Amino acid sequence: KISTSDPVRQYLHEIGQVPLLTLEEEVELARKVEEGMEAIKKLSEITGLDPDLIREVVRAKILGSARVRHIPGLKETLDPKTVEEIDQKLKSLPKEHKRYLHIAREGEAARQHLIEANLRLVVSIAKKYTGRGLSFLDLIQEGNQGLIRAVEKFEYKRRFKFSTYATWWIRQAINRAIADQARTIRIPVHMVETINKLSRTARQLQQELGREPTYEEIAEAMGPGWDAKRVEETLKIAQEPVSLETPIGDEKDSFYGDFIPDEHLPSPVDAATQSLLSEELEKALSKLSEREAMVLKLRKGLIDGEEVGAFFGVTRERIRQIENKALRKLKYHESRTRKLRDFLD
Amino acid sequence: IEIVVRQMMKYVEVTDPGDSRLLEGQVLEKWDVEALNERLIAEGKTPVAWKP
Amino acid sequence: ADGGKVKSDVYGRVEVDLVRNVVRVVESYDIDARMGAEAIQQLLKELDLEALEKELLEEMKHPSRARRAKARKRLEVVRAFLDSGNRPEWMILEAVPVLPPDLRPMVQVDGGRFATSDLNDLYRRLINRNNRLKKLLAQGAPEIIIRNEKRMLQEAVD
Amino acid sequence: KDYECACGKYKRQRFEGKVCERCGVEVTKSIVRRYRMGHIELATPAAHIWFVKDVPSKIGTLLDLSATELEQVLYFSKYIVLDPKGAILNGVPVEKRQLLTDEEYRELRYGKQETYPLPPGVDALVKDGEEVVKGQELAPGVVSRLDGVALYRFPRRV
Amino acid sequence: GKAQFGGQRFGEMEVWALEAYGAAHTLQEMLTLKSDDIEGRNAAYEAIIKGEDVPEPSVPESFRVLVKELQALALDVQTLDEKDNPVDIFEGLASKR
Ligand SMILES: [Zn+2]
Numbered sequence A: 001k002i003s004t005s006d007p008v009r010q011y012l013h014e015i016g017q018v019p020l021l022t023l024e025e026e027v028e029l030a031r032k033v034e035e036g037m038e039a040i041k042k043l044s045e046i047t048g049l050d051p052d053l054i055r056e057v058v059r060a061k062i063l064g065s066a067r068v069r070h071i072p073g074l075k076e077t078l079d080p081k082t083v084e085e086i087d088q089k090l091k092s093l094p095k096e097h098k099r100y101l102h103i104a105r106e107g108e109a110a111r112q113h114l115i116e117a118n119l120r121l122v123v124s125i126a127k128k129y130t131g132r133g134l135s136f137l138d139l140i141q142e143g144n145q146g147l148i149r150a151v152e153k154f155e156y157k158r159r160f161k162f163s164t165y166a167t168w169w170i171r172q173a174i175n176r177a178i179a180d181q182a183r184t185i186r187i188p189v190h191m192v193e194t195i196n197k198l199s200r201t202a203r204q205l206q207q208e209l210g211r212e213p214t215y216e217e218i219a220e221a222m223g224p225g226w227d228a229k230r231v232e233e234t235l236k237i238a239q240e241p242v243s244l245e246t247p248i249g250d251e252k253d254s255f256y257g258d259f260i261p262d263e264h265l266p267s268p269v270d271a272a273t274q275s276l277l278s279e280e281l282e283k284a285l286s287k288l289s290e291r292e293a294m295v296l297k298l299r300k301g302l303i304d305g306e307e308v309g310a311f312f313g314v315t316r317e318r319i320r321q322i323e324n325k326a327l328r329k330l331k332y333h334e335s336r337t338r339k340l341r342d343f344l345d
Numbered sequence B: 001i002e003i004v005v006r007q008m009m010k011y012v013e014v015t016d017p018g019d020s021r022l023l024e025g026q027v028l029e030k031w032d033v034e035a036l037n038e039r040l041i042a043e044g045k046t047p048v049a050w051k052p
Numbered sequence C: 001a002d003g004g005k006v007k008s009d010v011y012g013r014v015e016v017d018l019v020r021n022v023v024r025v026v027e028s029y030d031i032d033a034r035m036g037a038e039a040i041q042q043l044l045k046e047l048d049l050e051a052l053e054k055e056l057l058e059e060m061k062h063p064s065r066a067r068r069a070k071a072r073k074r075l076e077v078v079r080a081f082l083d084s085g086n087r088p089e090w091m092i093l094e095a096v097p098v099l100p101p102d103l104r105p106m107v108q109v110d111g112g113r114f115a116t117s118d119l120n121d122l123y124r125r126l127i128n129r130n131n132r133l134k135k136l137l138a139q140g141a142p143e144i145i146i147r148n149e150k151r152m153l154q155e156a157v158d
Numbered sequence D: 001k002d003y004e005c006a007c008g009k010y011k012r013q014r015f016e017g018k019v020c021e022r023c024g025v026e027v028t029k030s031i032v033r034r035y036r037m038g039h040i041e042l043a044t045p046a047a048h049i050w051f052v053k054d055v056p057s058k059i060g061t062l063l064d065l066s067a068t069e070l071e072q073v074l075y076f077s078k079y080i081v082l083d084p085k086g087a088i089l090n091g092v093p094v095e096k097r098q099l100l101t102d103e104e105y106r107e108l109r110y111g112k113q114e115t116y117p118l119p120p121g122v123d124a125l126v127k128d129g130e131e132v133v134k135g136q137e138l139a140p141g142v143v144s145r146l147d148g149v150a151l152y153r154f155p156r157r158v
Numbered sequence E: 001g002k003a004q005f006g007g008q009r010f011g012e013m014e015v016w017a018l019e020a021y022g023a024a025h026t027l028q029e030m031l032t033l034k035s036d037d038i039e040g041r042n043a044a045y046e047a048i049i050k051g052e053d054v055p056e057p058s059v060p061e062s063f064r065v066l067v068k069e070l071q072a073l074a075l076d077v078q079t080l081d082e083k084d085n086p087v088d089i090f091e092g093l094a095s096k097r
Helices: A004-013 A024-045 A051-060 A081-092 A094-113 A120-126 A136-148 A162-181 A192-207 A217-222 A228-239 A273-286 A290-300 A316-336 B002-008 C036-046 C049-060 C069-071 C075-082 C119-138 C142-158 E012-020 E026-031 E038-050 E061-071
Strands: B011-014 C092-095 C106-109 C111-116 D040-049 D142-144 D150-152
Touching: A004 A120, A004 C142, A024 A051, A024 A094, A024 A162, A051 A081, A051 A094, A081 A094, A094 A136, A120 A136, A120 A162, A136 A162, A136 C119, A136 C142, A192 A217, A192 A273, A217 A228, A273 A316, A273 C069, A290 A316, C036 C142, C036 D040, C049 C069, C049 C075, C069 C075, C075 C092, C119 C142, C119 D040, C142 D040, E012 E026
Parallel strands: none
Antiparallel strands: C092 D040, C106 C111, D142 D150
């Protein structure tokens, strides 16, 4: 039964049950997030294990077993053996070093209780950026992709509040997704900030003139390197692919697509020309001294058409030689037996 | 009209099973065949009582 | 294992404080609780058909005319796979086929006008979600979201 | 395009059933491009809706679940389906193939109760529990006298 | 379109009429050569010009489109033979790489 509410609800359910203290607890978790990486960074030292390892293995010990490591990203690492093994070394580390394992673990745990206490902090924000071209959910989803990305970076020591800090990164993440997923034909961020201007300028001109601006009014208005061919060209692209499937004519049954022809496929009269062309050129291929014919033959023919590095051994002057001569003899033995004359093309 | 009607009666319900369960209702002759290979060719008759 | 996943005598999680040697231990063991087709997949891969069949053969021909009518309607389907059919794992999807290109073309029309079967848009949808999935899981993993996305995804899949 | 290559590394019939290295493109004209298929390896599975919203919910029949109301609960949501083993009790023991809710599932795994009575003022409650907290077991409903009858309504430790 | 005339729609009733008749082939003609067979009409056109009996009909795309269309849905539709052994409609173009 209709999504949206469930999530909006599921959030408030653990949000409405797990809100965070405006300072304290947030500052608490924070210290436990930073002392986390810092910790792990030392584990890697005392263990010659890549940070990427510790970070993962510590996460599973908390988030999920060997289950979440299998289906997500294939068995590169031993769901069973490899993971416990690593942990074995961590727990085997003397008090002085194991200290950090517990801190690491206690570290990632805090991250957990800092990302949730704001899932609504995202929703609110998302509430604004909406009708651009993404479900409310996605808009919220891409907002959370930003919430976390904002935790990895917050420095609690620099007294300024978290909530805020999150705002920035969140909007950052939503926009990207917007610019990057919004359409069917990928357009760059560049030619995006630029289309909006044009959409806008289109209105400023709608404002006073009355005549829907010619690609001149718009061009002058926009800026420098803006011609008339430019704006006209900018829009066809700023368009929206029309559904290959849409009611046409006295719309009833007749579906659009059936009005669009084909081209790759040669229609019977052409499939018959390659027939005649092939054989006839191939019959007029034999009445030749293969020593040079078969070089231009396959040249345009087989691979691709460069006269220089053309022939195997012999130099150039013998290329054109038999070329220009064979070609011509080839041209007049056909003038007689008129086969290609009436251009098969 | 008969040609068509006969199609209206080309299905029969089941009661006494052997291969597949009772309440099914299947093609009439798809039983003149089975019942035909369960009583004559391979004995141990499995009388499949059906219903028009 | 500390401040988390820890297998004891019969207690679930384990918290740890280094102030005093206080090692709290909540008590709920590995309670395999799942959802989404993940739950149903397992279940579909563990149902021994022959069993269920002989389970209802006996569940059919004996009880009153009630719970035996449900068992019949529930057997024909089992007998389906069971006959010369193909076992019931397949009902789930871990690999969504993708319709060919030229069947769902990408055409050029009146100038910038481009044409394309809506299908392409439903796919993209699906892709971006499925992709946000993994990428989300990777970067740590707050539960609410993992489902929310898996939920959204589940919609896209259909 | 026809027999032609992606970047023109090859361009004829002669090199029929063979492939390129730099770009990769077997070939016979475009025609193949409509007949060929591809997939999308999904993260977490999802089932063919066809099989879930058809009167005889093939996965709701073969699986004795609410033929159309149980899935609707676990599928498109977070309402668990107790997989195998489920030690601890919820009044009764493991619920083999039964279901539970976010409230109970979370009241199970992460132990039982997690209350958050946070005190008023600064010099109030800070003297009703601090002394009866650290390692001091506290019975259910124990009273916290100072500001507002702080009432811890759940067992064991503080 | 502009010059060439559009084809005629071979209505179901038109199908039955033929179906009713012993007009067996004639009906397959309409289901492939004269419309849905790319390989066909193609082979067909030429066949004539030179002077031969048309090439036995390949398959209709309408079907080929159904398999892939159906295939887009986790449902597999694979044809069979005398013994329940495969038969390839999309002629080899679906044999991976
Ligand atoms: Zn290439």
